[PDB]
């Protein structure tokens with residue numbers, strides 16, 4: 001028996017088998033309807049199909065499209081029988097309990113898996129680094145979370161959500177490149193702008209100094225080759241787009257930066273655990289992959305935090321898949337095998353068992 | 360060692376396993392094994408009652424007796440391991456996570472009982488006795504009490520009398536001098552756990568409450584022979600509930616005004632049950648602090664001289680809270696063992 005690990009994101013579904021070091025199937029989490037197409041198939045036929053996201057801001061809202069995503073992952077993407085594998089799933093922090101119950105109900109009634117488990121994505125990201133206590137910056141594609149975790153428990157009284165993630169940064173980069181004369185209004189243009197964001201954009205240690213250097217010299221400019229042979233030059237946008245994470249006002253959002261929200265979450269926590277939260281600051285998600293974001297986060301929090309406090313930011317190079325990696329570490333443990341919500345336990349207890357076993 | 364035995368033995372390895380945890384887990388194991396016995400429900404009910412009264416030594420002894428009786432069906436090595444573990448557990452007043460979870464669910468059960476067939480006359484007369492006790496500088500906006508919520512509001516409003524009407528009771532009390540709550544004002548902390556559960560303790564996704572601020576209260580370690588140190592099985596949410604002495608004063612004036620009431624003992628027990636439910640569910644005090652206030656020598660003398668026998672909110676049907684606390688304890692201990700294994704695995708992997 002091999003345990004399926006499936007991290008469901010707003011932009012990417014990352015699925016694979018426990019024990020693997022990387023998701024066997026990482027694909028966009030979109031559903032196309034004119035029969036339905038899921039993932040890359042729907043992404044290719046953007047003109048013919050209408051695309052919908054079953055997950056928005058990390059919380060599942062469209063359950064039919066989510067069920068289609070899960071079926072595509074099990075059969076069309078992993079090519080394994082769901083009924084033979086204990087399926088480990090993931091949930092967003094502060095997920096409504098009705099969503100967890102619906103998740104287990106669909107897992108056991110529609111897929112008939114022999115076992116399953118639901119874990120918070122930030123908790124898995126913290127597990128993947130060998131930690132049980134610490135604060136996780138889970139910044140993905142639809143939402144950013146600051147989640148303090150005390151011995152595997154995500155404290156609901158300090159978790160905070162910021163609707164500012166990789167997708168908003170892609171839109172902001174499109175806006176800036178339009179300001180510089182580059183036309184990016186189409187879906188393919190959005191995809192190539194996302195590619196530019198992934199390959200060239202970075203977090204500046206000091207935004208004002210970086211802007212001054214970009215204005216004065218031209219060393220920070222980088223060249224990018226568009227699919228249709230066109231070559232563009234990107235200058236200050238290599239650090240203006242990521243800066244929206246720390247200064248959301250760039251996109252008209254009145255909320256605080258990721259550093260300020262991290263400090264707010266740590267302040268909402270008991271004063272006895274704040275030192276451990278500062279010393280274990282885990283960055284996770286695709287939007288935390290910008291070069292220099294770890295140093296910038298450390299500097300900003302050191303500015304906000306008390307001087308005597310020691311702040312360490314943990315940003316593993318594989319942090320883009322750290323949720324799935326933590327899930328694969330989880331589902332392949334010997335002590336975890338009794339934690340699976342078995343089909344028998346679900347039958348004798350009902351969906352609400354997910355509250356009493358997965359917490 | 361089957362799956363059930365392996366799960367039990369893994370859970371017992373929990374370094375923070377305490378008496379409450381030990382009793383809950385072992386009773387769940389024995390209910391899975393010997394639950395088909397005809398005489399087992401008596402044992403389960405007796406252990407549940409011993410657990411509610413925090414008679415942990417008696418419940419542990421009964422569990423060990425049953426294990427040694429069914430040692431052939433359970434297994435001599437397994438039963439020996441359970442016996443060895445029973446003498447190795449303790450309790451810390453600051454963190455009794457399973458006991459706090461159980462006490463919160465128990466207070467919820469008390470409230471559920473009270474809402475069923477609620478009698479408003481009892482608490483109308485309680486409010487009238489409150490008006491005849493409260494000082495001139497304390498107001499009371501409850502002209503009359505008609506539903507459960509108003510009665511609970513009055514019960515919680517009894518805090519005004521504190522530091523005034525019950526100074527005599529506190530002075531004559533022998534255990535209140537052992538109250539060891541540290542008075543230093545530590546402020547407030549955010550929490551999403553209900554009742555007396557600690558902010559950082561795990562909770563079920565359906566058991567969390569809206570985020571709210573609660574006072575951060577600690578133990579005065581310098582006190583010699585404090586209540587909490589003396590009574591370690593009691594979850595320290597506060598020390599001995601002082602406002603319950605104000606409740607005792609109001610109940611004195613209630614009994615003196617209803618000496619001819621045939622059901623005075625029933626009404627007093629109902630009032631004490633509501634007080635215990637509200638003080639646990641709102642995190643002001645645990646079950647044992649209120650009950651030890653009612654179990655003091657001269658407070659018990661006060662209640663006896665009016666011929667009132669206090670049940671101390673004790674009910675005989677604690678099935679749901681006990682089973683939910685067993686599930687909670689299993690989850691906590693299993694997840695602690697899994698955290699140990701996962702930390703070891705990741706440390707060895709990298």
Ligand SMILES: Nc1ncnc2c1ncn2[C@@H]1O[C@H](COP(=O)(O)OP(=O)(O)OP(=O)(O)O)[C@@H](O)[C@H]1O
Pocket residue numbers: 008009010011012013055057058138139140141142143144165166167194197198199284285286287288289290320
């Ligand atoms: N190297 C990179 N630098 C910056 N952003 C990146 C990088 N690689 C990917 N991204 C962006 O990260 C996002 C996807 O991140 P991730 O897969 O962690 O989140 P998700 O699961 O889709 O979303 P969520 O969990 O927030 O609902 C996309 O917007 C993608 O463009």
Ligand SMILES: Nc1ncnc2c1ncn2[C@@H]1O[C@H](COP(=O)(O)OP(=O)(O)OP(=O)(O)O)[C@@H](O)[C@H]1O
Pocket residue numbers: 514515516517518521522574597598599600601602603642643644
């Ligand atoms: N109705 C209430 N509203 C707010 N806080 C309450 C209420 N009832 C009790 N408390 C709080 O519960 C905590 C402990 O309750 P307890 O009965 O010991 O009262 P206390 O005021 O601490 O007593 P004492 O003054 O004798 O130490 C205190 O912080 C008290 O203020």
Ligand SMILES: [Ca+2]
Pocket residue numbers: 007008009121140285323
């Ligand atoms: Ca994610």
Ligand SMILES: [Mg+2]
Pocket residue numbers: 521522
């Ligand atoms: Mg007081």
